[PDB]
């Protein structure tokens, strides 16, 4: 309504038209390489990346002409906000060159990391598949210890001096962009300003993560105590009944998930879990049938069909990483090397959920065609596969016998398997990001980085290092996300969101019984509730968008606790002759 505002709208109109054209062309160079990996496609991809990133830098320069204080249209403010951020441009050419070198070196060290046999230096193992296979399937305490320790001494020790300089440079970049530090800079993804009743400060995220973690601690402690007792049978004499779990016995290289502990902890092993892969092959199912079933599921809640261009341009059979593509101009695609299995049946529902999200906000301005925050998109995908895997859903589409009844023990097995992945990762994810936040804040001195890392592992996660690690180690950087400069708290917020979504959708569907058996299929009221948030994209604060589905403005862990309540009740009875919780004093080496 003002001259600057009116000029701002005109600039964004030009930007949106140009961004759509160039992004679509860039996306095609991305689709072509990922489907046909050739040097010609690598080079066109490499050229498109520089064209796309240079264009955004120039538009960022043009966007500085429109001060935000004189803008009153929030939708205009939101796009100008994104375009005006300077990023690493605030650094001198020398420091940005140094930071890029450090960033590329850390990534290269992680991805080329290999450890070799001490008695045969020509025999070496990479993380994938070599060390990961040991960390998942080995019952040899010392072989697992060798894998866990060698990775941290070969890779993590290399990263340690680089990570120190990475922290200094990232904090410099963040402060010059008017943040307290790099951690504060990352927490800006959740920031909301200028919307009365919906604001969210960057410091508020720390409070809400800590408060919700407190509420999940009783469930995690009971899961931990049950897993500890089973691990004492699996690794006799190596685990204290009152102590933390040794870090190298958790089923992967870090204990990020406890998924691979299932066969060591399964409550009722004589009862097998549901696997309709045999039913799918016996019904002559193929990849087209799977995505047709997924399309019918979304249609049944009121959501639209897949576009005709989706079927003609998608690659649904044999870069096989399952992805959903939003190229713009009405072009939506799914890339999946689909097999006739229950897993790919569930993943197909997950990936089409991304597409449904993309199609709902397609009319938003270019930069607002995104999830409401970094946790929303994967939360939307996860709740789709939750409904599809329930026996109620599998019986409806005839992949399960009509007389099927899930019993006491199969339900406990499923919830425990779900908890090892979903609940097990929450203390891990919180503790890791808290350490980074404190390091960025300057609260952990360099000469105490590993001392505080393992103090926090012991206290927050109930996990203890099997051997002592001085400050020549950088154990956090031995995880991909840390050495490759990715924020981690999204895996925590996404997890809480997905159960908030599912509980609201299932209440709208008038579901009777425990949450984990709910199927939202054939519920147009559930789809309407969900679509009300999906259409918004990023055009409204995530607090408002969350309120459109669940009726509340903030992250809340009660729905997750409700989902696992039958397991929590069973665990309490199981643990009534065991210690619940841990002492941080015990260690394998003391």
């Amino acid at each position: 309504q003002s001259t600057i505002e009116e000029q701002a709208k005109t600039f964004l109109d030009k930007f949106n038209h140009e961004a759509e054209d160039l992004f679509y062309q860039s996306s095609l160079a991305s689709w072509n390489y990922n489907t046909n990996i050739t040097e010609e496609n690598v080079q066109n991809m490499n050229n498109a990346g520089d064209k796309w990133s240079a264009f955004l830098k120039e538009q960022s320069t043009l966007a500085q002409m429109y001060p935000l204080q004189e803008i009153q249209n929030l939708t205009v403010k939101l796009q100008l906000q994104a375009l005006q951020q300077n990023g690493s441009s605030v650094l001198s050419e020398d420091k940005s060159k140094r930071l890029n070198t450090i960033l590329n070196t850390m990534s290269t060290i992680y991805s080329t990391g290999k450890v070799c046999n001490p008695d045969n230096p020509q025999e070496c193992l990479l993380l994938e598949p070599g060390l990961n296979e040991i960390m998942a399937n080995s019952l040899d305490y010392n072989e697992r210890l060798w894998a866990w320790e060698s990775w941290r001494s070969e890779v993590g020790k290399q990263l340690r001096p680089l990570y120190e300089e990475y922290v200094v440079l990232k904090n410099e970049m963040a402060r010059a962009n008017h943040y307290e530090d790099y951690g504060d800079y990352w927490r800006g993804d959740y920031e909301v300003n200028g919307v009365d009743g919906y604001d969210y400060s960057r410091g508020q995220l720390i409070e809400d993560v800590e408060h919700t973690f407190e509420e999940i601690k009783p469930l995690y402690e009971h899961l931990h105590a049950y897993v500890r007792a089973k691990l004492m049978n699996a690794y006799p004499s190596y685990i204290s009944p009152i102590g933390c779990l040794p870090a190298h016995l958790l089923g992967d290289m870090w204990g990020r998930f406890w998924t691979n502990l299932y066969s060591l902890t399964v409550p009722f092993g004589q009862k097998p879990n549901i696997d309709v892969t045999d039913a799918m092959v016996d019904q002559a199912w193929d990849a087209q049938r799977i995505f047709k079933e997924a399309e019918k599921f979304f249609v049944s809640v009121g959501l639209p069909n897949m576009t005709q261009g989706f079927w003609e341009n998608s690659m649904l059979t044999d870069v096989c990483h399952p992805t959903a593509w939003d190229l713009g101009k009405g072009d939506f695609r799914i890339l999946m090397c689909t097999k006739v299995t229950m897993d790919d049946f569930l993943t197909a529902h997950h990936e089409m959920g991304h597409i449904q999200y993309d199609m709902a906000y397609a009319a938003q301005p270019f930069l607002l065609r995104n999830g409401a925050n970094e946790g929303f998109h994967e939360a939307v995908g996860e709740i789709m596969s939750l409904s599809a895997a329930t026996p109620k859903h599998l019986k409806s589409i005839g992949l399960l016998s009509p007389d099927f009844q899930e019993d006491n023990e199969t339900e406990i097995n499923f919830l425990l398997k779900q908890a090892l992945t979903i609940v097990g990762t929450l203390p891990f994810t919180y503790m890791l990001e808290k350490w980074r936040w404190m390091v960025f804040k300057g609260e952990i001195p360099k000469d105490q980085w590993m001392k505080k890392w393992w103090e926090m592992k012991r206290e927050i996660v109930g996990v203890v290092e099997p051997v002592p690690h001085d400050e020549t180690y950088c154990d956090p950087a031995s995880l991909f996300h840390v050495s490759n400069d990715y924020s981690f708290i999204r895996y925590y917020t996404r997890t809480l969101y997905q159960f908030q979504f599912q509980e609201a959708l299932c209440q709208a569907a008038k579901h009777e019984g425990p949450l984990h058996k709910c199927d939202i299929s054939n519920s147009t009221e559930a789809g309407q509730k969900l679509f009300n948030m999906l259409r918004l994209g990023k055009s409204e604060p995530w607090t408002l968008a969350l309120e459109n589905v669940v009726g509340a403005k903030n992250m809340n862990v009660r729905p997750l606790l409700n989902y696992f309540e039958p397991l929590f009740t069973w665990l309490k009875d199981q643990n009534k002759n065991s210690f619940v919780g841990w002492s941080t004093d015990w260690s394998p080496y003391a």
């Binding site: 961004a19 992004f23 860039s26 996306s27 991305s30 390489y33 990922n34 991809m45 498109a48 990346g49 796309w52 990133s53 955004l56 960022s60 994104a82 375009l83 951020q85 990023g87 870069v319 992805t323 270019f366 930069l367 065609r369 995104n370």
Partner: peptide, 13 residues
Amino acid sequence: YFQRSVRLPYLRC
């Protein structure tokens, strides 16, 4: 992977 983002326009494949 190309993205609709000013902080991370390109993601490694």
